[PDB]
Design an enzyme around this catalytic site. Sequence first.
Site, PDB file in Angstrom:
ATOM      1  N   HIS A  61       0.862  -1.248   0.000  1.00 23.36           N
ATOM      2  CA  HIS A  61       0.000   0.000   0.000  1.00 23.36           C
ATOM      3  C   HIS A  61       0.859   1.244   0.000  1.00 23.36           C
ATOM      4  CE1 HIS A  61      -3.340  -2.731   0.590  1.00 23.36           C
ATOM      5  NE2 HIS A  61      -2.782  -3.152   1.731  1.00 23.36           N
ATOM      6  N   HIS A  91       4.812   6.876   7.385  1.00 17.57           N
ATOM      7  CA  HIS A  91       4.621   6.477   5.994  1.00 17.57           C
ATOM      8  C   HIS A  91       4.155   7.749   5.272  1.00 17.57           C
ATOM      9  CE1 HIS A  91       0.697   6.216   7.923  1.00 17.57           C
ATOM     10  NE2 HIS A  91       0.264   6.653   6.742  1.00 17.57           N
ATOM     11  N   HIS A  93       1.745   9.184   1.640  1.00 16.32           N
ATOM     12  CA  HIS A  93       0.794   8.981   0.571  1.00 16.32           C
ATOM     13  C   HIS A  93       1.238   9.949  -0.532  1.00 16.32           C
ATOM     14  CE1 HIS A  93      -2.062   6.933   3.367  1.00 16.32           C
ATOM     15  NE2 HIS A  93      -1.435   7.743   4.240  1.00 16.32           N
ATOM     16  N   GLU A 103      -3.731  13.472   1.254  1.00 12.01           N
ATOM     17  CA  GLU A 103      -5.049  12.952   1.741  1.00 12.01           C
ATOM     18  C   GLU A 103      -5.900  14.141   2.233  1.00 12.01           C
ATOM     19  OE1 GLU A 103      -4.197   9.382   4.161  1.00 12.01           O
ATOM     20  OE2 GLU A 103      -4.906   8.511   2.297  1.00 12.01           O
ATOM     21  N   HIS A 116       2.722  10.967   7.291  1.00 11.79           N
ATOM     22  CA  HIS A 116       1.966  10.643   8.526  1.00 11.79           C
ATOM     23  C   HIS A 116       2.884   9.994   9.530  1.00 11.79           C
ATOM     24  CE1 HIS A 116      -2.040  10.565   6.096  1.00 11.79           C
ATOM     25  NE2 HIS A 116      -1.656  11.801   6.462  1.00 11.79           N
ATOM     26  N   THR A 195      -6.911   6.400   7.642  1.00 10.97           N
ATOM     27  CA  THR A 195      -7.327   6.635   6.269  1.00 10.97           C
ATOM     28  C   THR A 195      -7.212   5.376   5.415  1.00 10.97           C
ATOM     29  OG1 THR A 195      -5.201   7.296   5.447  1.00 10.97           O
ATOM     30  CG2 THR A 195      -6.594   9.049   6.464  1.00 10.97           C
ATOM     31  N   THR A 196      -6.748   4.245   5.981  1.00  9.80           N
ATOM     32  CA  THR A 196      -6.765   2.975   5.306  1.00  9.80           C
ATOM     33  C   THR A 196      -7.628   2.004   6.118  1.00  9.80           C
ATOM     34  OG1 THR A 196      -4.736   2.468   6.557  1.00  9.80           O
ATOM     35  CG2 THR A 196      -4.448   3.233   4.304  1.00  9.80           C
TER      36      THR A 196
END
Length: 257
Positions: A61, A91, A93, A103, A116, A195-196
């Site tokens: 991911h 991590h 995004h 995000e 994040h 958010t996942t």
Amino acid sequence: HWGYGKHNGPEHWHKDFPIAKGERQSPVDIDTHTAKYDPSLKPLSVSYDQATSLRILNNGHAFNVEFDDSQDKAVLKGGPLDGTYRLIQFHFHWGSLDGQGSEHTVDKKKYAAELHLVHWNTKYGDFGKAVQQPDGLAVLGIFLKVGSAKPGLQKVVDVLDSIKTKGKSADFTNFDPRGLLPESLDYWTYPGSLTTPPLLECVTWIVLKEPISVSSEQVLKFRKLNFNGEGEPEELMVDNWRPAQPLKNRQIKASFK
Ligand SMILES: NS(=O)(=O)c1c(F)c(F)c(S(=O)(=O)CCO)c(N[C@H](c2ccccc2)[C@@H](O)c2ccccc2)c1F
Ligand SMILES: [Zn+2]
């Protein structure tokens, strides 16, 4: 099963994780004119001087950098938080192009990426218990824009060729996450969720107003990662962001103005 594509992405997640349509989902658009300045919010305290990174993993991911959180070392407190939260991993995004990837959005503006830093509330003893709680996590979000290089990121960038595909991991020690912070710790804050999947409503979000700059070459290296495992068709790891979700009942508070 879940991922970021047409048949398994955000619009599908609610079938396995019905909270996806809950009341405190993340991310959100931060309407900066509507955010309430809260004079009672404290400065955020970020104490990362003793942080101990352990490894880096491509989980199919994103990639994670996980820390040793077995001592009282890298901690977030103050700001909107009660108590102490321990850093466990970070991590990112990011997008397929510089105009998307974040995000959270700010007055509908998308940034190229979002970092994040995930912390758990020490009153719940470990992160698996904390995610079951409404105040279990504090996630510090930092926007990335493309411009000048971020020298503190380059150690991450240079190890990515070793974790190209899902399942690959490496040793990743002595990474100092202070090198990923902007100058200012002014922030917005609101109650939300992972958010996942599993999208748990356990997060106090703290989003810094000041983005960091990274170079075009640094973000191009993120976009050479793969979603797939070694020996499956190559699908570039890009656009691993959830879009903004309905704000519903909630108030975003500003630490500034
Ligand atoms: N954007 S977000 O901050 O909401 C988010 C992510 F976007 C994200 F990609 C991850 S991830 O671990 O990199 C891959 C997806 O699980 C996690 N990781 C979760 C996590 C790690 C440490 C402590 C708490 C949560 C995930 O590993 C997890 C989820 C649920 C229960 C236990 C762990 C995450 F929290
Ligand atoms: Zn995240």
